[PDB]
Amino acid sequence: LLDFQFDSFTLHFQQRLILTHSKDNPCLWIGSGIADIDMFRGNFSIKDKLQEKIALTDAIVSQSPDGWLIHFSRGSDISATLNISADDQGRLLLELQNDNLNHNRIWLRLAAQPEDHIYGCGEQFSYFDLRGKPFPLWTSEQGVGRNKQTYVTWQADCKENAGGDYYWTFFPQPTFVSTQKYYCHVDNSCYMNFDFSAPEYHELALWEDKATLRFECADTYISLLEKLTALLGRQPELPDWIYDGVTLGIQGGTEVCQKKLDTMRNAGVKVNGIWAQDWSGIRMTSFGKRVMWNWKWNSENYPQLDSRIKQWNQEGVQFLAYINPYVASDKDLCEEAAQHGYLAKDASGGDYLVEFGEFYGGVVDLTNPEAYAWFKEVIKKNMIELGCGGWMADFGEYLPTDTYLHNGVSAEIMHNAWPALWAKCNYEALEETGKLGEILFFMRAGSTGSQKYSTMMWAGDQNVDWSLDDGLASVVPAALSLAMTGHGLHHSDIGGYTTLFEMKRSKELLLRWCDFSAFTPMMRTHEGNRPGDNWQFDGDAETIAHFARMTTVFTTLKPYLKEAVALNAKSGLPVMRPLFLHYEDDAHTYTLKYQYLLGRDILVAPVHEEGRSDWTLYLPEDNWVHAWTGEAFRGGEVTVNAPIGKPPVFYRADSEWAALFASLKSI
């Protein structure tokens, strides 16, 4: 189980070499720094002012009750302790504590092999295999473009550092899987940087004076994910109605929603819902219309919505809304918050207001237990009691680092923990009203614990483009990285979101994205931030009939998806899966980024480029049947015709669901 051999030492854990240390090749450095943060409205620029970094070359080992205690030191005056133990469940527990609080930097090297791959670290959009690169772990806006060599990224960076880079995300997490078949989970929420660049070791940098790391091994990845999710959390089963069609993203009030619902339904589209983020009203800005950030039904913008929700529910249509953890400073909720001390504060003791351009929002202080209770009641009374079937629970990634919080923990530490705290507020609202498995909320931000508390992740803001780092393609590493970090329910905005700098959503992008989303567990559209510039679900008859066809595809898969979702809830086996979960012996499957398995038996490789008439993907060794033609294929690279509406989807001839899958092509 734990094999500690000892000047120099080695620690093996179920035969994986975890730590090696000598005077000449230490495993531990400590020191100190000052965080140098430029927030840029959530587009954080975060770097160190490094003061010291000192190698703790000397170690003295004692036997401990639980396991081992290593005293690391350098000279007479600098030291740290590392306790090594099994935890309650047999996980390897490493507990590091620096000599004093002033040494707020740790660098720890974990032994590795040059061939190892590494997956996880939350939701990663440019890399799935993380080997070869470093990953700062700091929740932020995800970036527009995300690649310093693309034009959109350069444009966004000219304005508020908004372009981002390959590691930017709203759901980074200090949790990874190695192909030595273990996971490592770090309890801290400070800034960290996980460096997977060096062939012989991983280096984990923490901006704290202490660290706690836990490891478990397993015989298979599937077992590993079961263990990881026993640690972090498992999601609920989705409500049954999620499988019944597309949720239409509509703004502009009750009657606009009505007309669009009818147009789609009368053309044969399977529609399970309407998601109207302007349920709370419309705020005019110099850049067009924004949602009004006060979380109560606005009967001026949505007349008769209370009775309309009932009528829609009678016809099999749920109503979904929107909430975030800020409150518009000129409206009711924020005044109430200001009166009861429910807002975060600034250094001078005033209520902290964040600028979102011309308008401001108070930051709800979720570490204040009365503010938390209060905001949960807002959810219960203003959304659940109104009859909402779900909502977007947006933001979480932008707790400013110069807030002062009720629990007295530094915002430098609370910033990364904010998303799962927000998620818990939502989850408890449902738990307390008996609505788990009936109401569905979806989030973009996350952190450790979102695995229990977020009932569905969405991929946040993609560009309305075909880029690798911020377009349709980027959703696939996002799903797969999350899957390997223990969250197995994931979807994206059908057609993407970010409509800036002359990017506008084509019909072709919308239809290709619809083809992708019909092979995921949830179908939901978005108008984008500039709705008039984008092609929408009702743009013409061909678009509408396309939605009719692919929503019929999606609804036909219902029982298969429902089985997959039940496995996710039961054992953390995610719905969209890396191919190596089922083809472990196939070396090629470890480096794939842009294809996945939907449950066990369907392989999907979404077309993510403009102007394609065919598509090339990889099949591992199995008996595959192309969904649309019934052509049989074996293992290897394959190129197939891929017109819109016939995405590159294959299923296993031997699946017990083969008769359901054979029926797809005659829809």
Ligand SMILES: [Ca+2]
């Ligand atoms: Ca983006």
Ligand SMILES: [Ca+2]
């Ligand atoms: Ca009116």
Ligand SMILES: [Cl-]
């Ligand atoms: Cl790929």
